[PDB]
Design a binder for this molecule. Structure first.
Ligand SMILES: [Mg+2]
Ligand SMILES: [Mg+2]
Ligand SMILES: [Mg+2]
Ligand SMILES: [Mg+2]
Ligand SMILES: [Mg+2]
Ligand SMILES: [Mg+2]
Ligand SMILES: [Mg+2]
Lengths: 127, 99, 107, 79, 114, 100
RNA sequence: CGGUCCGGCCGGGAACUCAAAGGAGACUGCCAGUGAUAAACUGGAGGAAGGUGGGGAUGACGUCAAGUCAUCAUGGCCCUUACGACCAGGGCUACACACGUGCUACAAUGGCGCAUACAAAGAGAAGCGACCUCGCGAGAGCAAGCGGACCUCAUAAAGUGCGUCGUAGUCCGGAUUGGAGUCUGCAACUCGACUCCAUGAAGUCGGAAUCGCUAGUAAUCGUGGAUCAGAAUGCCACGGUG
C-alpha cells in the first residue's frame, strides 16, 4: 500500500513513495550515496527517521526538481514526515515535538528600488 | 483532424468568460473537448523613473499580465465549426485558430 | 533592543556528532556561506586532536574550551578561530588543531 | 582591429591617389579621411590630414603602410 | 642546467621552471614539453643532459632573450621615429590603447607628486 | 526635443527603407560569400558611394509623442514619463502599478 | 501498468509534481496565569501558518523659494539672410591634481588541471539561432526548430571527488605594454568589445575618520533583462549556498 507526502522548500518540490519493507533509497534513479555529495545532506533526511525506527523496514522512492544541495534535502525531510503521518497517523505528537512538519516558508526577500540588495544600501556620506 | 483555440487576454476575470462560452457551446452540440488548460502566464514587468531629474531612488513599478487559455477540440463536427467560428466574444480577447 | 527584547536563535546541532556547541563553532569559521568547506576543515582538525593528541574527541575540545573562557562559550570559540588564521602552518585544519592543543595545555 | 576581408579606404581619397601617380607630385592634398589604411602606392606624396581646424601635411614613408592617416594628426593642443 | 636562455631556471617542476625565461609563459611551456616528450611535473633532478638540449632545440625557433628585449624596443622605436600619434604616447608615458587620463593612470604616469 | 531634430529622424527612416533595406542587404551578402568572389567582389567600394543616413546604426529610437531620445521603450515607443501619463488616465490597456 | 534500441520515448495512466480560475483556512478563536472584573501581556495546546505569519503596494498637515523653462505643459522677454538650419571633421573620453561612488586584489576557507551533481526568473521574427564541420580560441561556414510550458539563447557558477602547488611578492594578484587576430557597423586613429601569444606595476589586509545590516538578512556565487548595430566593474530582477 502506497503512502504519499509532499515536501518542498524555496524552489524545490519532492514526492515521497512508501512501500513496506527494505532499506532502499532511490533518488532520481540514483542511490543515496551517489546523488548526495554533501555528507550533511545525507544525515538531515535521516533526522525524521530517528524517533521512528527504520533499518530495513520501508522503501522510499523520491524524485525532486529545483533548488540546490540543502533545498532538495529540506524538501525530502518535509516529505517523509507527511508520509509517516499518512502511514500510521499516531506519530504526530513526536513529529510536532521535533519541529520537522513545519514548512520553512522563509523565501528570498525581493530586490528593492534604490538598493543593490534586499537590505544592503549603497554607501552613505555624513556630510 | 484536430482544431485548437489559443486564447490570450489581459484580464483574468475576462479571459475565462470568453473561455466558458466556447466550451459550453461545444458540449451542447455534441463535440469532444478535453477541457481548458491553464498555460503559464507570460508577465512582463516595467520599472522606470518617475522623476525627470535627480532623486534617482523614486521609481515606478509596472506589470503587464498576459494569461493564456487553450481549448482542444477532437472532432471537427460541422455543427461545432459553424457555431464557434463567428461567435461574439469580448474585445480584449485575441483568438488564434489552428485548423 | 530598547523595546524589542527577544531571544537568540537555536540552530540545529552537528549532524555528525549530535553536539549543539559544535554547530556554533563551524559557523564562525564559515565565510561566504561555505558550510561544506568549513566543516571539512573542522572535522579534519579534531581528528588530528583525537588520534595523535589525546582520546575522547568530544572531551578534548571541552578542555581546550574551558581554559579560554552562551556568550562565554561564544567569545571562547571566536578567540580560537581568529588566532588560528594568523599562524605559521600550512592549512587551516593544521592551524586550528595546534590551537586546541595549546588551549588544552593553557598556553 | 579591422577584419582581414578588405582594408578600408574612402572612394574620394582613392581617386586623389590615381591622378597624383600619373600626373606627378603636386601641392599637399587637403582631405578629411582620417580612417583610410595607407597603401604602398602612396609612398612619396604629401597628404594634408585634417585635424579639426587645420590641415597637417604628412610626408608618406615606406614603413607607414598598414596604419591609418588619423594616427598622424593630433586633435588637441596641449600645454 | 643552463639553456641558450643563460639565466638559470629554478630547481622545481618543468612547466614552472620554463616560465622564468623572458618570453615563455605557461601556455608556451606546455607546447615545448608536448613537442619534446617530457612530463610537466618532472623536476630538474633526473632531468638528464639528453633531455636538456632537446629543450634547447625546441626553444631555438623563438627569440627569447635580450634579443627579444630589443625587438620589442625597436618596434616602439619605429613608432617614435616616424612621428605618429601612437609614438607620442610612449615618449611621455601616457596610455595608448584608450585608457582614460582624468585619474587612475598611475602605472603609466609613475608615482604621484603635486 | 526640437522640431528640426525629429525632422532628421524621419529623413533617416525614409532613406533606410529606400537604400539599405534590400540593396545593401545584397552588398552585405556578396562581401560575406566564402564560395565565390574571394578577392574581387568590390561591394565595399560601391557601399561607400551610398548616402550615410540610410544606416540603421545612425538612427535613434525616440518618443513618438515628445521626441525624447532617452528612456525609450520598444514596447510602446514612448519615453519613460509619457508611459505614466497614459497609464494613470487609463489609455494603455492592462498597464497598472505592480506589487510583488 | 505493457514496450524495449534504456530517451516519457510509445501505447497509455489523470494519481502525483507543475501550470492558474475559484474557494476554505488565523479570527487572542480556545485554555491557564497576571492585570482594577478593562484593554492587553505572558505561557501552552491545536494548526502548514499565532499573536500586525513573510514580503510588497499603500507615505497626513506641513517643512527646505529643496529638484525640474533641457520630459512635457505655461505668463513674459530676446534673436530672426540669425541665438536658426545643412554637412565634413573634432570635442563631450584631454591631464600637472583634488573629492565622492564601484570592481578585482593582496590568496592555501586559495590557485590550477581532470572528472562531475543540483537552479529559479526572463528574452527571441530586420530575432533567438540548434545539429554537423573547421579553428587553440574570439568565431566562421553549413543549416533545422520556433511568434513559442514544444525550439533556441543555455553546459548556471560556487559545491563535490582526485591529483598538484607548501606560505614566497609565489603556479598569488592581474595592471600596463608589444605583436598577431575575431565580430558589429558607411567607417573601430583620436574613442569599441572580445580572443590568442608574450610582458607581469602597485599590492603581503590598509591612519584619523566613516558606512551597511537583527534572518533566509549580512556575506558570497553566478544567471537574465531594460538601454543597445555594437559598446556594463552601473542599474534592474532572479535563484544557489548561508
Ligand atoms: Mg617567461
Ligand atoms: Mg516643445
Ligand atoms: Mg546608435
Ligand atoms: Mg489562489
Ligand atoms: Mg535653490
Ligand atoms: Mg595567476
Ligand atoms: Mg530593523
Amino acid at each position: 500500500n502506497q503512502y504519499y507526502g509532499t515536501g518542498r522548500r524555496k524552489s524545490s518540490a519532492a514526492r515521497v513513495f512508501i512501500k513496506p519493507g527494505n532499506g532502499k533509497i532511490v533518488i532520481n534513479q540514483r542511490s543515496l550515496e551517489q546523488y548526495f555529495g554533501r555528507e550533511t545532506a545525507r544525515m538531515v533526511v535521516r533526522q525524521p527517521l530517528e524517533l521512528v525506527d527504520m533499518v530495513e523496514k520501508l522503501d522510499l522512492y523520491i524524485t525532486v526538481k529545483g533548488g540546490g544541495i540543502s533545498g532538495q534535502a529540506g524538501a525530502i525531510r518535509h516529505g517523509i514526515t507527511r508520509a509517516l503521518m499518512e502511514y500510521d497517523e499516531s506519530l504526530r505528537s513526536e513529529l510536532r515535538k521535533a519541529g520537522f512538519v513545519t514548512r520553512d516558508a522563509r523565501q528570498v526577500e525581493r530586490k528593492k528600488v534604490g538598493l543593490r540588495k534586499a537590505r544592503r544600501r549603497p554607501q552613505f556620506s555624513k556630510r | 483532424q484536430r482544431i485548437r483555440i489559443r486564447l490570450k487576454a489581459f484580464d483574468h476575470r475576462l479571459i475565462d468568460q470568453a473561455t466558458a462560452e466556447i466550451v459550453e457551446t461545444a458540449k451542447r452540440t455534441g463535440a469532444q473537448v478535453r477541457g481548458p488548460i491553464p498555460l503559464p502566464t507570460r508577465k512582463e514587468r516595467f520599472t522606470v523613473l518617475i522623476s525627470p531629474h535627480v532623486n534617482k531612488d523614486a521609481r515606478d513599478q509596472y506589470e503587464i499580465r498576459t494569461h493564456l487559455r487553450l481549448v482542444d477540440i477532437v472532432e471537427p463536427t460541422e455543427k461545432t465549426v459553424d457555431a464557434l467560428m463567428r461567435l461574439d466574444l469580448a474585445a480584449g480577447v485575441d483568438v488564434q485558430i489552428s485548423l | 533592543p530598547r523595546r524589542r527584547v527577544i531571544g537568540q536563535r537555536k540552530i540545529l546541532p552537528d549532524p555528525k556528532f549530535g553536539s549543539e556547541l559544535l554547530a556554533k563553532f563551524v559557523n564562525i569559521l564559515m565565510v561566504d556561506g561555505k558550510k561544506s568547506t568549513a566543516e571539512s576543515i573542522v572535522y579534519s582538525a579534531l581528528e588530528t586532536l583525537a588520534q595523535r593528541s589525546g582520546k575522547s574527541e568530544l572531551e578534548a575540545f571541552e578542555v581546550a574550551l574551558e581554559n579560554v573562557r552562551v556568550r562565554r562559550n561564544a567569545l571562547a570559540m571566536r578567540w580560537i578561530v581568529e588566532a588560528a588564521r594568523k599562524r605559521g602552518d600550512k592549512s587551516m585544519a593544521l592551524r586550528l588543531a595546534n590551537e586546541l592543543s595549546d588551549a588544552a595545555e593553557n598556553k | 582591429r579591422s577584419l582581414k576581408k578588405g582594408p578600408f579606404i574612402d572612394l574620394h581619397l582613392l581617386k586623389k591617389v590615381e591622378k597624383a601617380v600619373e600626373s606627378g607630385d603636386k601641392k599637399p592634398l587637403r582631405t578629411w579621411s582620417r580612417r583610410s589604411t595607407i597603401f604602398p602606392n602612396m609612398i612619396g606624396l604629401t597628404i594634408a590630414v585634417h585635424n579639426g581646424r587645420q590641415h597637417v601635411p604628412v610626408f608618406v614613408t615606406d614603413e607607414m603602410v598598414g596604419h591609418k592617416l588619423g594616427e598622424f594628426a593630433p586633435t588637441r593642443t596641449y600645454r | 642546467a643552463r639553456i641558450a636562455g643563460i639565466n638559470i631556471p629554478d630547481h622545481k617542476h618543468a612547466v614552472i621552471a620554463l616560465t622564468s625565461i623572458y618570453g615563455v609563459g605557461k601556455t608556451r611551456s606546455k607546447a615545448i614539453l608536448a613537442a619534446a616528450g617530457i612530463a610537466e611535473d618532472v623536476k630538474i633532478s633526473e632531468l638528464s643532459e639528453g633531455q636538456i638540449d632537446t629543450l634547447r632545440d625546441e626553444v631555438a625557433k623563438f627569440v627569447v632573450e635580450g634579443d627579444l628585449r630589443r625587438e620589442i624596443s625597436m618596434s616602439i622605436k619605429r613608432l617614435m621615429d616616424l612621428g605618429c600619434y601612437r609614438g607620442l604616447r610612449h615618449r611621455r608615458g601616457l596610455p595608448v590603447r584608450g585608457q582614460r587620463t582624468k585619474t587612475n593612470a598611475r602605472t603609466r604616469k609613475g608615482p604621484r607628486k603635486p | 526635443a526640437k522640431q528640426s531634430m525629429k525632422a532628421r529622424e524621419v529623413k533617416r527612416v525614409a532613406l533606410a527603407d529606400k537604400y539599405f533595406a534590400k540593396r545593401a542587404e545584397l552588398k552585405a551578402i556578396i562581401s560575406d560569400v566564402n564560395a565565390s568572389d574571394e578577392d574581387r567582389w568590390n561591394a565595399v567600394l560601391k557601399l561607400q558611394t551610398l548616402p550615410r543616413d540610410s544606416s540603421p546604426s545612425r538612427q535613434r529610437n525616440r518618443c513618438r509623442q515628445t521626441g525624447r531620445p532617452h528612456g525609450f521603450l520598444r514596447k510602446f515607443g514612448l519615453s519613460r514619463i509619457k508611459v505614466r501619463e497614459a497609464a494613470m488616465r487609463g489609455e494603455i490597456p492592462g498597464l497598472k502599478k505592480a506589487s510583488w
